[PDB]
A and B are shown apart, each in its own frame.
Chain A
Amino acid sequence: FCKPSSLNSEISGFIGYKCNFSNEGVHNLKPDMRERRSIFCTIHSYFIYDKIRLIIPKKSSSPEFKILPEKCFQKVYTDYENRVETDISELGLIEYEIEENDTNPNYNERTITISPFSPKDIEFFCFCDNTEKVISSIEGRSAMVHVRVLKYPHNILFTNLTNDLFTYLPKTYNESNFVSNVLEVELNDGELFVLACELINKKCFQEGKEKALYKSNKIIYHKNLTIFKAPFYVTSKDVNTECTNYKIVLKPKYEKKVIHGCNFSSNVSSKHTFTDSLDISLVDDSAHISCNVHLSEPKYNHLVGLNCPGDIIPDCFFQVYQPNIVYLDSQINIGDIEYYEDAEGDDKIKLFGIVGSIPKTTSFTCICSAYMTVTIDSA
């Protein structure tokens, strides 16, 4: 048993989101001849205990960057029609961490750590303007760093096992609700469970009691909390996960999951039951067979795949064909896309899950003449 502060290891560079705007960095806002375009940084995320770093050079050694406002992560901007220096606490952010690490001799490292406790989407801006610098009648470039924190769409589990109450969330379970010294947890899909305990085992939350390991790869060991991310897609309702003596057992509520896909599989022993099942080798090898996947939902919580054998080109769904390959997140423009890798006997099954709401229309293609085109509309 150990405290969960160092249970999430000591691997540095977990920042991720880093809107770098510095002179030595390659996204510089200096006036230059090779580039004459402003730089953007747009982030949409379900922000779970990560951090955002702004590496910005200071006002010393000539006033370089007009940071608007001057205390960016202490006071942050609203929409541009009503740009006032609103405080960081007025938005609705719950249990944040702000670090104005200026102790490095080259930049103002402004870091914000955001917990997912919010009842609404929180959008904020910090401008970095250098149009005051005129060199050879060519002005500087502007940045409009825009972070749009999104609410977690699934439900969140948070029980009580510590002395100090917090009450940022409606309390579900407690030690008085610990029925028969065993917690039976029924997650739906992809939720997170927060046991407020300060002493958990070193190799717990990584195995299972009945069979296999009901787990994903985003288990977060906070200094005062303990949160694991449930996987979006599981095999059957026969696996579980337990850690501990207060014994908490977590098992998924596996219903009959439906995944959209062409699924030209040859093996009948396939655990994934897709929508379409049209064969590939049944037809002759001269026709241009095309598979269309049209997606139109207001709130996407979907999971699309394929089960055709042979060779899958390109590496779907990491890079997909242009409507000539391009990344899936570059066309969808939404983060939090899960991907599952399957190593079967004969048929190759690949699947990805998208949660959120896309701004624009993307119609990407994966070729198994068998072509599978997946189109998702802006709506």
Chain B
Amino acid sequence: EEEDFKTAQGIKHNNVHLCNFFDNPELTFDNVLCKIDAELFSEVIIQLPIFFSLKPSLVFDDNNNDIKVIGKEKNEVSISLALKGVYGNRIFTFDKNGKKGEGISFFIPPIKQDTDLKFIINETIKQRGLIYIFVRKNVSENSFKLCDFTTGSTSLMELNSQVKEKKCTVKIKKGDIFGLKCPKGFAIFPQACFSNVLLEYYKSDYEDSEHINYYIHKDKKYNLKPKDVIELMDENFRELQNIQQYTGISNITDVLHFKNFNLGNLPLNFKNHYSTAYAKVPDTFNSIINFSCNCYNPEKHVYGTMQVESDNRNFDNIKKNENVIKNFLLPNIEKYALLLDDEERQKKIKQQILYDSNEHICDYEKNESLISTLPNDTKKIQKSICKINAKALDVVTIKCPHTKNFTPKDYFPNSSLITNDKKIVITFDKKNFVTYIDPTKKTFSLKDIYIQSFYGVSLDHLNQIKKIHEEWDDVHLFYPPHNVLHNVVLNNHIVNLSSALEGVLFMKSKVTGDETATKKNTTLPTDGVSSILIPPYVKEDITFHLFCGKSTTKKPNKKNTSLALIHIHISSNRNIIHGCDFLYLENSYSIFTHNKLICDISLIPKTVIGIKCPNKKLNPQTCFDEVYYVKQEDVPSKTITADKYNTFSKDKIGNILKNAISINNPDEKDNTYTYLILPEKFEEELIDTKKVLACTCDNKYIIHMKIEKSTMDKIKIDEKKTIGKDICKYDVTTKVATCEIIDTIDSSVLKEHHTVHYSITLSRWDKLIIKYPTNEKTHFENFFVNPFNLKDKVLYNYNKPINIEHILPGAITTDIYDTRTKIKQYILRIPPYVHKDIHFSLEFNNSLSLTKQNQNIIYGNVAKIFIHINQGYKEIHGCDFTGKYSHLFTYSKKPLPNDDDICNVTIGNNTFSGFACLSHFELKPNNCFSSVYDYNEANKVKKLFDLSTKVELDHIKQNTSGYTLSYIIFNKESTKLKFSCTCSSNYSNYTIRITFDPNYIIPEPQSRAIIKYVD
């Protein structure tokens, strides 16, 4: 009976349907039919107090997540079966200001039929609440593309040992809604498809864009596939997150205005649920795209790939725009100037750790002509890039053009309104998050929690960012438009800078356009300038981006709107940085030693110490420049408070410590980190061991910066550090450089030399194997490498961690974690063509590990390896299909579409050969140049060592550029065969055919083009 049910519509707000039975007077259990007219991609979130019991009774457990509904046949089924590919069925427990309860969340998939989910709430048994989710049909049969990997012809659940991939390809036109459904135990790959996809190809039409294209293509880094990742990894660590770290993540679909609806980095339990993903194409799509998402089980290593290429395949109807001129603005690097070292850097470098703080300016305020529309043609627009690569403990200042006396309007703090009356704590799988309610009709969203786990901001935060940039009535425009340098775009994600780059201090700089010459609060829309300081300890390599464009019209029209892209790459430099974190006491990274409310920090020469304190909540407002200079006998070490510190001396740190540089500018609203560079030398003439330089924090915690006398006496034994002479061994027949410097960095023995350097001069096709220990040994508990990512980065100019592919394109780098003895093997092979003389170094250091044996303390040593790579003028007679490897190979073609190409090369004895393809291409056969497609036995699989037992072979699937390289060299073989490999894609097919003939060689040009660099 309709009159017997208290019918109420669901609260619809920000495409979120809410049925709040918890704190809403309309939905009260004092009588409840919560009917939700669920449209496409609408989040159904149900709130409840703690109960009485549900009819799909769900107990709170980690392994209990099978959310049940009731179908049309009145059978208690799973929601993954009643809704054809539901996504996001989660059970959470939420507390609002003390009052506890639970909630059920899911989303709505596109379905071609009519279905209804019934959630029945019961009591200890009457019927209490009936959440009737009415999901009507929203897609036709021809407007719904799908590849189920649970049944049909693409089922992996009955996959054999021989075949393991049921590849699917269904094409998408404009206005289509599509998705991917995975079976049980098979996680969606990568995390939150289709906002994370494995891209292969994307061709952009200019007429599709209704705004300016704010996408970062990285280094044209289309992503890999899981079939090509797991062949080169470790053994035990083969979970989903490591394979996702090794395969590359792209988020082009959110920039392309696809309606992507998923769960972010908080997915479901894949071992008990069908992980499902969806995306909606825009209605003005006339472009060509290609990507893939996977259903992957990382126990049996079974994958299903849904390679989706779009409907259009013609590359003549794509209106490639001629209005875009791409320009370059390289950033400027200057030596460190502190209003008196500006003259000192000028005087000393003219005659020629303060050298590791190099200042950077990317000046788009001055170079506005690269984002100004040229009067030679009004229709031409300009696009500019600015690639910045900097290390830790650096300072970088960004300049972008601005309107004078610009007022940033405060609608964004008006839309923030962050109070305590909206506080809801939501916990699932014993993991907590904090969320707020929109104060209009008591509405919140779990999509905001998924966005917070993905973008780092809230839902209303993202909406107000988009509306602030869309309603831009000013001339100069920014991306991200609010709070620039406190929000940055890293891997197409607007997130806070100091949250990601943990420990960043906003520096001060002179504001241009003002004659005061005073360093003040600088913000990029307001003053046209913003300075930041890089933290000393960086965990991983990161890269964030900015845009500051200028349009001649007052609107972002894109037919005259210019753009300036700032591309800052921050390298991970790993040392040990001392300090006292106050946030790990109460995931959050801590970069401090934390020698545990009284905090003792020993002053060491040539290091940086740091306090994570709130900016004005600590009792000295200039604490690192002030000092509570008091003796240790004055302070009771056990029974003390922060009030006695009120009765202490307040001498400055520039008087006692000679040139200790205290960096703390706490006047900003969001400064949480303070630092101090301790100088090169200490003196007992001004410092007593009892006399410490103390501070306090929040009137409860205290920090004592005392200096120990034995710690000062341990510095005073250093008198000899010479250079080693080619002690890295070289097996010259096998051409393998074996380096064993484990005993020199071992702190268990007495070592004469603290720092030694080993010089290696290599050539092409030479191997370098270095054995280095890890942090799970004896006498190696504080071992660190330099740089931290040796598989990708080296040390340019002895301190800067740079990518190896920008100086040696095509190096073969492999790190093997030997857990039988907990050591690591570094294996690096030079590609057969080396285009330039390359120098770098790799350092190992165990100087912070201690050996206190027989009342004698001995520390470790420093061992760095010099690497010189010579001029590899020998060209590779292979067939390139990448375009950028025209220096390596002879036949070079840009990867144009519809390029079904054949390349024919006949090789012989003692001659290099190989190929390069793009890494996302379908390699045929799997692992080319190992099991070749032999042509003399009519193009079938045959192992190369079966056909030729004296060959040499290497193959790297993906470097940092994103390409696949393979090389083969035959040495003293006299058979006759012929072998081919096919790089097959969804738009073009390439074939390389190499003929093995011993007495026939290619007629040589008998020299090489000598590339030389002069200065």
Contact = CB atoms under 8 A, between A and B. Distances in A.
Given A24-B883, A318-B910, A40 B1005 contact: no
A136 B894 CA distance: 30
Interface stretch (A77-85, A86-94, A172-180, A307-315): A307-315
A287 interface: no
Contacts of A16: 875, 890, 1004-1005, 1007-1009
A341 B877 contact: no
A150 to B, nearest CB: 10
A336 B892 CA distance: 25
B332 interface: yes
Nearest to A41: B1009
A18 B1008 CA distance: 8
B904 A43 contact: no
Contact of B329 (A37, A135, A313, A335): A135
Contacts of B802: 34
A244 interface: no
Interface string B834-850: 01000000000000000
Contact of A38 (B879, B1008, B1013): B1013
A13 B763 contact: no
Nearest to B809: A26
Contact of A220 (B878, B889, B1003, B1012): B1003
Nearest to B807: A34
B330 A32 contact: yes
A45 B1010 CA distance: 12
B755 interface: no
B1011 A40 contact: yes
A8 B1003 contact: yes
A43 B1009 contact: yes
Nearest to A30: B328
Contacts of A38: 1013-1015
A80 B889 CA distance: 33
B594 interface: no
Interface in A34-66: 34-46, 50, 55, 61-62
Contacts of B329: 135-136
Contact of B874 (A13, A42, A220, A327): A327
Given A9-B906, A62-B325, A319-B763, A17 B1007 contact: yes
A102 interface: no
Contacts of B890: 12-16, 18
A136 B385 CA distance: 12
Nearest to B1013: A37
A220 B1004 CA distance: 10
Q: Which of A32, A62, A330, A367 has the most CB of B within 10 A?
A: A330
Contacts of B905: 11, 13
A46 B330 CA distance: 42
A227 B1011 CA distance: 31
A106 B1012 CA distance: 25
A37 B871 contact: no
Interface residues of B, number: 64
SS class of chain A's interface: helix, strand, loop or mixed? Answer: loop
Given A9-B906, A37-B1014, A50-B1005, A343 B328 contact: no
A217 B1006 contact: no
B326 to A, nearest CB: 8
Contacts of A213: 999
B1013 A136 contact: no
A299 interface: no
A326 interface: yes
A27 interface: yes
A261 B763 CA distance: 25
B328 A322 contact: no
Nearest to A311: B733
Contacts of B883: 24
Contacts of A330: 870-871, 873
A324 interface: yes
Interface class of chain B by DSSP: loop
Nearest to A324: B761
Given A136-B331, A330-B870, A27 B1011 contact: yes
B787 interface: no
Contacts of B716: none
Contacts of A277: none
Residue in A18, A50, A318 with the greatest tally of chain B CB atoms within 10 Å: A18
Contacts of A15: 890, 1005
B887 interface: yes
B344 interface: no
Contacts of B761: 322, 324-326
A118 interface: no
Given A17-B1009, A41-B1009, A335-B1008, A31 B328 contact: yes
A218 interface: yes
A333 interface: yes
B886 A106 contact: no
Q: Which of B367, B889, B905 has the most CB of A within 10 A?
A: B905
A19 B1003 contact: no
B891 interface: yes
A106 B883 CA distance: 12
Contact of B1015 (A25, A37, A220): A37
Contacts of A343: 972
B798 interface: no
B1005 A24 contact: no
Given A17-B1005, A135-B329, A40 B891 contact: no
Given A11-B905, A37-B1013, A311-B733, A217 B894 contact: no
B904 A11 contact: yes
Nearest to B731: A313
Contacts of B333: 33
Given A136-B332, A219-B1003, A325-B761, A25 B886 contact: yes
Interface in A277-319: 311, 313-315, 318-319
Interface of A: 8-20, 22, 24-27, 30-46, 50, 55, 61-62, 106, 135-138, 213, 215, 217-220, 311, 313-315, 318-319, 322, 324-327, 329-330, 333, 335-337, 341, 343, 367
Which 8 pairs show the lowest CB-CB distances between chains A and B?
A: A335-B1007, A16-B1005, A13-B890, A13-B891, A313-B732, A40-B1012, A217-B1001, A37-B1013
Given A19-B1009, A39-B1013, 19 more contacts: A11-B1002, A13-B892, A15-B1005, A17-B1008, A18-B1009, A20-B887, A25-B886, A32-B330, A41-B1012, A62-B325, A135-B328, A136-B329, A136-B367, A138-B330, A217-B1003, A218-B1004, A313-B733, A325-B762, A329-B1007
